[PDB]
Structure formats: structure tokens, C-alpha cells
Amino acid sequence: SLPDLKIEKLDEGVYVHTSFEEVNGWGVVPKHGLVVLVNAEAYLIDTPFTAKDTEKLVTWFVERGYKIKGSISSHFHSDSTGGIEWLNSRSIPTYASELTNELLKKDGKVQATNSFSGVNYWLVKNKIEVFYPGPGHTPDNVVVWLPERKILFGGCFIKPYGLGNLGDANIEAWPKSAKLLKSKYGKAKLVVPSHSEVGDASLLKLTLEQAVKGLNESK
């Protein structure tokens, strides 16, 4: 009996969707993703945990005149991919990196129907960019950049106050990856993490600090 899916305007044409799980040992965890509008078309940046919540989310925007053109999953964990099966079931195109789909397959999960590879990928040319900084929270994690309003979705890689679940993490690489991300995206106006509140580009420095600290206090 946890809070319900929330949808909230972040900037013009950019919405944050927040869904909720109770995870043993952590308590209630929020999960943020985005819905990005381009004309009468909406793009999901990460899916909620469940089919149910992905249905709610899609319907919210359809009922407002938008076609759901596709969704992109920042990494293979359920908090980014839990809605792929329902989106596939609706013939909404789903995008994940080639590395994420191979991890979905190995984890016994349904994969995204469209895959991409490389450091930079345009989901929508000059409007929605995907960037791979390196392994960190997971081997596959990517971030999503909106050049318009200078908004960076960092997924579960942006971890300003603690790294979270390290089961699938690479703590060796994470400081390397986080320095790179800070370098590329220092001029972001807004940075959206998966599990804490939106902030500015200082969240990139905080993440780098948390990655260094986790490497150091790993010995």
C-alpha cells in the first residue's frame, strides 16, 4: 500500500514519472524516468517497474493527444525495463543498447525490440541523445541527454548520496565513468537520478565522489 505513479511537468515538454517499490532492507524506493514530448509524440525514458504502471503512464499521455513513439531503457534492471513486455505487446517500439538486451536475455527477460550500440546514439536527432559513460552501477548503464533544455537523465548511475545496490556494479570502473560524465555534461541545467531528487550538475560531482569513496572503502 505504497504511493501511486506520479507524473509531473519538469520543464516544457519534459515530464518526470515516479513509481514506487518497497524493497526489503531499503524501504520505499522511488524510481524516476522521463516522458519527453516532440510535437504530438511522446518518448519514454525508462519504464516503471510494472506493466500496470506502464499502462497508466502511456494512457495519461494518449488521453492528452500524444502518440507513444517509443521508449528507451537506460539499463537492464527491472526499474528501467519492467514495462518493455507491455510496450512490446502494444507495438510501441522499445529501445535498449545491444549490451542491455544481451543482459536481459541472460537474465531470462524479454528484450527490447530495437537495439543500438556505440558511445553516442540519437534516439531522435538533435533532441534525444543516449551516451554510454562506462560501466558503473551496471556494465550497460547509459544516460539520456536533452539538448533543448539541457536535461540529463542519469538513471541509476547518478547516485549522489550513496551507490545503492552493488550486485551488478563495477566499482573499479565507476569513478572513471563518472569523471567522464562530469566532463561531458557539466553544463546540464538539470540532472535526473533514478532514486533521488532532481538537482543541477553538482549531482555529477557528488556521484564521482561517491564512486571514489566506494572504490576506496572497498579495501
Q: Which residues bind Zn ion (CB under 5 A)?
A: 77, 79, 156, 194
26 binds, among ligand 5ZX, Zn ion, none (CB under 5 to 8 A by kind): ligand 5ZX
User: Is 156 within any annotated ligand binding site?
Assistant: yes
Among residues 17, 31, 77, 182, which one is catalytic? 77
Q: Which residue is nearest to ligand 5ZX (CB)?
A: 164
User: What is the enclosing helix (H) or strand (E) of 18?
Assistant: strand 14-23
Among residues 17, 179, 182, 195, which one is catalytic? 195
Residue with cell 539499463: 75
End-to-end alpha carbon distance in the chain: 40
Among residues 109, 165, 170, 205, which one is catalytic? 165
Q: Is 71 helix (H, G, I), strand (E, B) or coil?
A: strand
The answer to whether 77 is a known catalytic residue is: yes
Q: Which is nearer to ligand 5ZX, 24 or 91 (CB)?
A: 24
23 binds, among Zn ion, ligand 5ZX, none (CB under 5 to 8 A by kind): ligand 5ZX
Q: Give me the residues that bind ligand 5ZX (CB under 6 A), please.
A: 21, 23, 26, 29, 31, 79, 137, 156, 159, 162, 164-165, 194-195
The answer to whether 159 is a known catalytic residue is: yes
User: Is 195 within any annotated ligand binding site?
Assistant: yes
The grid coordinates of residue 161 equal: 548520496
Phi-psi region of 84 (alpha: psi -120 to 50; beta: other; left: phi over 0): alpha
The answer to whether 17 is a known catalytic residue is: no
- Specify whether the CB–CB gap between 73 and 49 falls below 8 A: no
The nearest distance, CB 163 to Zn ion, in angstroms, is 10
162 binds, among ligand 5ZX, Zn ion, none (CB under 5 to 8 A by kind): ligand 5ZX
User: Is 17 within any annotated ligand binding site?
Assistant: no
**DSSP assignments along 125-164, one per residue:** TTTEEEE---SSSSTT--EEEETTTTEEEEETT--TT---
- Specify whether the CB–CB gap between 203 and 189 falls below 8 A: no
The answer to whether 75 is a known catalytic residue is: yes
The answer to whether 137 is a known catalytic residue is: yes
The nearest distance, CB 174 to ligand 5ZX, in angstroms, is 12
d(CA 84, CA 98): 15
Q: Which of 105, 92, 95, 109 is nearest to 54 (CA)?
A: 92
Cite the annotated binding site by residue number: 32, 75, 77, 79, 137, 156, 195, 197
Catalytic residues: 75, 77, 79, 137, 156, 159, 165, 195
